Design a protein around this ligand. Structure first.
Ligand SMILES: Nc1ncnc2c1ncn2[C@@H]1O[C@H](COP(=O)(O)OP(=O)(O)OP(O)(O)=S)[C@@H](O)[C@H]1O
Ligand SMILES: Nc1ncnc2c1ncn2[C@@H]1O[C@H](COP(=O)(O)OP(=O)(O)OP(O)(O)=S)[C@@H](O)[C@H]1O
Lengths: 309, 309
């Protein structure tokens, strides 16, 4: 039995945050203790949204409720989108305490700050969080899944080539996490502009005390839509598949990405079905077809192959 | 697809309310929009607990967030334990509006108000809701899953025999819902004192335009432990199987009760395993093994047979 503490947002409708994380982890065999950092009607990509946000003090109370009953015992910790610096500090405190309690605990972190629109890079999170993630969160993480912009923000270096990207990933390894995946990047692909490039790096221990970094690269088809909650889903499935494949980042990333691709392909198909023929689907019609993809999440058909560098 | 609006509690750890309803319904192929009426660390059976309660105003805003985006379209509505009169009135208003929008909507309601400890009957809910449930909720409900004590409260008449139980169920049919299932009772079983009796009743329209009431009985073995969330799970799975078998309450209840049986058998097994040999398992060790029972929930092996009266 593998228990994951997932502290993420909750939407009444749709799949972002914990809604995008609990179902896949449960279908993949993980107990999930879920702290819903917000309760919104839907994700903010909609025209409107209503709801409430959990205060950090409220998050602390929940964790203390678990601690008092001696149930604050976890094998993993999963976090994602946060706009409250204090809440991030609370999460870091909790992770440190759980790691004192269990040295084998794995903290998977999606450090969400921004993304590259067109060629420009833009942050959708308060700026005062960049120090935190860099100085307090990522140092305590074991798996991080940033995108190129976030990788650049964390390392302070811009990425212009794949070799520069892996130098940045080595810097991130040095900051803390032994597994680093750059989920998206503006690096060119060998198949064309319709494919996106993602890279992975896992540093592993040797018998002599030394350490070897395994590097992998993946090219994925781009689906022509903007989806929300994809990162959150990606980090959950990466957690699961790295757990089953702790020494093979290649296989874990292959399974994860294939499952993402399956989910997105089904989602874009059903979205264009709901919308008129040749019509732009709305955020509501682009909600991930999570339920309808259960089997794909359980045992994905491999549709991408990672190259070991 | 089939979308369910489920307004129930949420626990960080464990399976009650939405935690006990979302996963099975999603695994059974239903889109689920979930409104967490509360967020607690764990259910109140533990030694300690902390969390927050959603206000009715907050519930209204979530529903309005869905409405403004033209996303308040549902095939089912599912509710359970509530302690606030205003919250129940809000739920009733929402159900009324959704039924105005769609006459085919089915409201599944577990009218949770109390249960029978030993032979005595005791209430878990403020008294001012019993009028509400009787006068405002049940009238707009289509499926209800009360226990003997709740059925007695709603009907105002005590149940001493199975014939009296079906008279009470006919009264409840008269109050609104065309399907009524009494999930637990103190009626004797021909197989022993370790069997629990559940009864069902569905009013169905015939081809001639008239209506026939189908009644069924189920004898199920007691598992000697106290579980939490079982009503929530029961109602969710009953919703699913009645959707699959709209004219066969027999099969729907057989599947539902079999899944419950599988889940509870696995749960008591693993709970006694976690606890010492010959040790009473704790509330924490008796949390439903929801994830590990996925497959049984997907397609339960029939282990009980309902007799058609
Ligand atoms: N339109 C898309 N086409 C193909 N893959 C996508 C698409 N959107 C998301 N993905 C997949 O989802 C992963 C994460 O994407 P996103 O998270 O949406 O983008 P991102 O830039 O990583 O944003 P983050 O990591 O959450 S802040 C990517 O690495 C892809 O695997
Ligand atoms: N100890 C048990 N032994 C066998 N079956 C059980 C047990 N507890 C729960 N169940 C199953 O789950 C259902 C339990 O429903 P209950 O939780 O008893 O409903 P209730 O507690 O009587 O009141 P409500 O309003 O439904 S929450 C039963 O119909 C059984 O299917």
């Amino acid at each position: 039995e593998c228990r994951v503490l997932s502290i993420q947002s909750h939407v009444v409708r749709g799949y972002v945050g914990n809604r995008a994380a609990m179902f896949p982890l449960q279908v993949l065999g993980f107990e999930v203790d879920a702290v819903n950092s917000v309760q919104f009607s839907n994700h903010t990509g909609y025209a409107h949204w209503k709801g409430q946000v959990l205060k950090s003090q409220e998050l602390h109370e929940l964790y203390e409720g678990l601690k008092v009953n001696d149930v604050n015992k976890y094998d993993y910790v999963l976090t994602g989108y946060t706009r409250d610096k204090s809440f991030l500090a609370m999460v870091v405190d909790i992770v440190r305490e759980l790691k004192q309690q269990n040295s084998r605990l794995v903290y998977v972190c999606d450090p969400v700050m921004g993304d590259k629109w067109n060629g420009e890079g833009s942050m959708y999170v308060p700026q005062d969080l960049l120090p935190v993630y860099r100085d307090k969160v990522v140092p305590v993480a074991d798996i991080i899944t940033p995108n190129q912009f976030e990788a650049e923000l964390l390392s302070g270096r811009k990425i212009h080539s794949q070799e520069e990207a892996f130098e940045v990933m080595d810097m991130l390894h040095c900051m803390g996490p032994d597994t680093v995946v750059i989920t998206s990047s503006d690096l060119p692909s060998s198949q064309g502009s319709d494919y996106l490039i993602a890279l992975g790096s896992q540093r592993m221990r040797k018998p002599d005390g030394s350490t070897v970094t395994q590097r992998i690269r993946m090219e994925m088809r781009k689906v022509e839509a903007v989806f929300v909650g994809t990162g959150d889903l990606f980090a959950a499935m990466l957690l699961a598949w790295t757990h089953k494949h702790p020494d093979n980042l290649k296989v874990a990333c292959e399974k994860t990405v294939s499952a993402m691709q399956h989910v997105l392909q089904r989602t874009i198909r059903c979205a264009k079905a709901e919308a008129g023929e040749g019509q732009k689907p709305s955020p509501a019609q682009l909600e991930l077809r999570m339920v309808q993809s259960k089997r794909d999440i359980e045992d994905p058909e491999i549709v991408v192959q990672a190259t070991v560098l």
